[PDB]
Write a protein that binds this ligand. Structure first.
Ligand SMILES: [Zn+2]
Length: 46
């Protein structure tokens, strides 16, 4: 696709749940947990 000659290109790991952003993938992964715990039912649907 958008091939080229450029490396060392990190990404802005953003959360598609609340609206956060981290530097390292792990950081985000750990955060997401806050949204996913013990399958707490809610207004999610219905
Ligand atoms: Zn979040």
């Amino acid at each position: 696709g958008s091939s080229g000659s450029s490396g060392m290109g990190e990404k802005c790991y953003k959360c598609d749940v609340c609206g956060k952003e981290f530097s390292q993938s792990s950081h985000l992964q750990t955060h997401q947990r806050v949204h996913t715990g013990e399958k707490p039912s809610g207004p999610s649907s219905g």
